[PDB]
Paper text:
Two of these, exotoxins-S and -T (ExoS; ExoT), are homologous enzymes consisting of an N-terminal GTPase-activating protein (GAP) domain (73% identity; 81% similarity) and a C-terminal ADP-ribosyltransferase (ART) domain (78% identity; 87% similarity). The ADP-ribosyltransferase activity of ExoS and ExoT and their cellular toxicity are dependent upon association of the ART domains with 14-3-3 proteins. Here we present crystal structures of human 14-3-3β in complex with the ART domain of both ExoS and ExoT. Collectively, our results indicate that 14-3-3 proteins act as exotoxin chaperones rather than activators.
We co-expressed 14-3-3β with either ExoSE379A,E381A or ExoTwt ART domains in Escherichia coli (for details, see the Supplementary Methods section). Using immobilized metal ion chromatography we isolated hexahistidine-tagged ADP-ribosyltransferase domains of either toxin—ExoS233-453(E379A,E381A) and ExoT235-435(wt)—in complex with untagged 14-3-3β. For both exotoxins, ion exchange chromatography (IEC) on heparin sepharose, as well as consecutive size exclusion chromatography (SEC) coupled to right-angle light scattering (SEC-RALS), indicated the formation of protein complexes of various constitutions. A complex with an apparent molecular weight of roughly 95 kDa (heterotetramer; expected molecular weight 104206 Da) yielded crystals of space group P21212 that diffracted to 3.24 Å. Our crystal structures revealed an extensive interface between 14-3-3 and the ExoS and ExoT ART domains. This site involves the C-terminal α-helices-8 and -9 of 14-3-3β, and can be sub-divided into two parts: (i) The two proteins bury a common hydrophobic core made up of side chains originating from the 14-3-3β C-terminal helices and the central β-sheet of ExoS/T (primarily strands β4, β7, and β8). In all our protein complex structures, the phosphoprotein-binding site of the exotoxin bound 14-3-3β protomer was occupied by an amphipathic peptide containing the LDLA-box in a short α-helical segment (ExoS residues 420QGLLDALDLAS430) in which the D427 side chain hydrogen bonded with the 14-3-3β Y127 and Y130 side chains, and the hydrophobic side chains formed hydrophobic interactions within the amphipathic groove of 14-3-3β. Both positioning and interaction pattern were virtually identical in previous crystal structures of ExoS-derived peptides in complex with 14-3-3 proteins. We concluded that LDLA-box 2 binding to the second 14-3-3 protomer was an intriguing observation with possible implications for ExoS regulation. It is conceivable that LDLA-box 2 might participate in the formation of higher molecular weight 14-3-3:exotoxin complexes, or fold onto the ART domain. If such an event was coupled to catalytic activity, it could provide a layer of regulation; possibly, multimerization acts as a sensor for the presence of high amounts of exotoxin, i.e. conditions under which heterotetramer formation would liberate LDLA-box 2 from its binding site.
Residue numbers in the entry:
A (entry chain G): 234 to 377, 380 to 430
B (entry chain B): 3 to 70, 76 to 240
C (entry chain A): 3 to 241
D (entry chain E): 234 to 376, 380 to 430
The structure:
């Protein structure tokens, strides 16, 4: 929507305009691309900090936020499930969520497509994430692969383990997906497990 | 009957919970001597899992009653079930060695059938006795180890077939060989190797792997609890 | 093998959940032509209940898959042939138990409590037969079921207390037959209301050994009416 | 104990002695027999009334209750289940208990051994009761019935009504269990539809 696109350039301007033309066919409107871009840039830090804290957003922050929300509308299915990785140091939103149960990050969920994140060092938490409501944003800014999920996106903790290094290794799946998601038809049955 | 007609009969027998029929259909598909599809393999396994499983439960039941004054037919009955069980195992083991294991092309499939070979040799050794027992137990350990070696070299530590093997082989060590030491060793390793490389998880079978990893974790915490000790208290 | 050995084998089979074996043992005990005890009767019934029951479930499953398919090809053709295989098995089980009833069980029955049980049983398996039967053969089984049930129902009415679990059990099964088989919700709800009302009217007749049996069946009768009745309302005050 | 036996006589007290024809080797002590007797006589009405409402018991009522509660702790579960009958006019404690659930009458539960009670007229509630913790007070000084203790929890196995008003129940003493009124594999052997 232009009202948002204009309001965006009025506050960030040069930084906002920068991201226009960074998509092959372009499913997202000029306003949405800019908000996602501005997030991926440097605003992700302060914006999520504000959402998580429950703090009252800036004009430009509310702008980026509704710009993202708009793009996160219809982008659910997205027929395929995607594997992404996220690391945290000194606190994770999902530490509050016990295994089998659901919870969410009050900020937007940034997860990289690169498995390097899962094998990165000196982390607090390392989590492999499965979901489809995410938005592929990488290539846009400022380097060269990452999927980002909506604020307050409820996730089920499928597995948690505090390894021989104090690091929590988790498996997160998007709550929506179901109970039959992640299972290869009757292979568990065919494996004749002891249990 | 054509291969397709058989597979369809098998699927219907599964639904109808006519496992003897299901086993019969899939045995015939296997006996056509062709590289079974993963769906075909699964059908065969699920069928025989249920045919042998029934006899295992009856055995355990009758064997439990044997513990608790003309219990001559109790023994006879256990022995009737014992006979059935062996014939089932010898049916699936012939299928494995003659068709399934040689026809396996991809290591994923070879590991499955070798896991299977140790599984049914374990079922055999549960009712076997004397020198015959020490053979089955060894045949089990050989099949399970052969698969374990192929899995460690060709599959990711999160693979459901690799993890499934880990659980079953670990259970074999605990239950059959009576080595809680080797059982926990296998399970801790397999679990730890999988959590270390959680990025290797497949988007099609991730909840399969996590589930098995949970069963490994559960077994480990149970088994270590059964093997405590002494001393300063 | 001795009668006692066979009953032990049947009791073992039951525990092992090897019903085919359980039925085999009890068939042989019955075939010894001597009046079954209540324990023997129970064993025979529980065994055959489970042997025929398996095929009934298998039938219902396949018949449903066979009527919920768009695959107007081989997949449905398989369904029918398989349904017919189970149909064949089911009939063989029913004839086997019906022969046992008519040849041994019903004539050997001394106490009316036992005679009603075996006649109830005779209706029960004729109803099982009727569920899969077709044409003129179907109309025979349905009427044979009814005859056996009604014959049992008169004796229970004249010889058993309205709270008797065997009388109440017959009540429920005969009422289910009318609903499911004859497709008469009227006659179904008639039998059920009556049987239930008779029993609540004479709750003092309850046996201290089988009272929770009686109450349980009365609950199932009450449930059936309150259901069969909600599915058949026939009213519009907008006249 | 004699402390209660003596207390009962220097109070009620010629009415108390009455129920003592000696025996001499009964299951219940002189004190207990008197208490149960005095209940069965005329004190059942006023005693239960105060128990059900809350009202502090009269010096005499306290002792009857004392003697009664003592006899129940001496007898308790009597291995075989009895069938007894109970009537109500103007409300029943078990009306508050829905089917399958347990509840109790805050007073003592008097039940007659005569099935005439179950087929009696002008009733609010009619209940056939199955228990073991009861006490036969017909074999005691005259006359036929079985008493269950105060606050005895009972499971409502069945309830129905009517053409019109009177509700009929099946009560089983909570303690008895789950396997209590079932004849070994009969239900299974009846191959019911459900």
């Amino acid at each position: 929507d232009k009202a948002l696109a204009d309001g965006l350039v009025k506050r960030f301007g040069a930084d906002a305009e920068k991201y226009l033309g960074r998509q092959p066919g372009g499913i997202h409107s000029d306003a949405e691309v800019m908000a996602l871009g501005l997030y991926t840039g440097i605003h992700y830090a302060d914006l999520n900090r504000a959402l998580r804290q429950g703090q009252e957003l800036d004009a430009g922050q509310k702008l980026i936020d509704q710009g993202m929300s708009a793009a996160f509308e219809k982008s659910g299915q997205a027929e395929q499930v995607v594997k992404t990785f996220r690391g945290t140091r000194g606190g994770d939103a999902f530490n509050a969520v016990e295994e089998g149960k659901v919870g969410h990050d009050d900020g937007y969920l940034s997860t990289s497509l690169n498995p390097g994140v899962a094998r990165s060092f000196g982390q607090g938490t390392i989590s492999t994430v499965f979901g489809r409501s995410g938005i592929d944003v990488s290539g846009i800014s400022n380097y060269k692969k990452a999927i980002l999920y909506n604020k307050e996106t409820d996730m089920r903790v499928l597995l948690s383990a505090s390894d021989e290094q104090g690091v929590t290794r988790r498996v997160l799946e998007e709550a929506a997906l179901g109970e039959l998601s992640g299972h290869s038809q009757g292979l568990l049955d065919a494996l004749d497990l002891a249990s | 009957m054509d291969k397709s007609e058989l597979v369809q009969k098998a699927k219907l027998a599964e639904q109808a919970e006519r496992y003897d029929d299901m086993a019969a259909a899939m045995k015939a598909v296997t006996e056509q001597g062709h590289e079974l599809s993963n769906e075909e393999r699964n059908l065969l396994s699920v069928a025989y899992k249920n045919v042998v499983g029934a006899r295992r439960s009856s055995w355990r039941v009758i064997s439990s009653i044997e513990q608790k004054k003309k219990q001559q037919m109790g023994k006879e009955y256990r022995e009737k079930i014992e006979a059935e069980l062996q014939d089932i195992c010898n049916d699936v083991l012939e299928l494995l060695d003659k068709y399934l294991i040689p026809n396996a092309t991809q290591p994923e499939s070879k590991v499955f059938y070798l896991k299977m070979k140790g599984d049914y040799f374990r079922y055999l050794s549960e009712v076997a006795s004397g020198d015959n027992k020490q053979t089955t137990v060894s045949n089990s350990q050989q099949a399970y180890q052969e698969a374990f070696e192929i899995s460690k070299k060709e599959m990711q530590p999160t693979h459901p077939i690799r993890l499934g093997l880990a659980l079953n082989f670990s259970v074999f060590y605990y239950e059959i060989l009576n080595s809680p030491e080797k059982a926990c060793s296998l399970a801790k390793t397999a679990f730890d190797e999988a959590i270390a490389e959680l990025d290797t998880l497949n988007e099609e079978s991730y909840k399969d792997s996590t589930l098995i990893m949970q069963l490994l974790r559960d077994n480990l915490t149970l088994w270590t609890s059964e093997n405590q000790g002494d001393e300063g208290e």
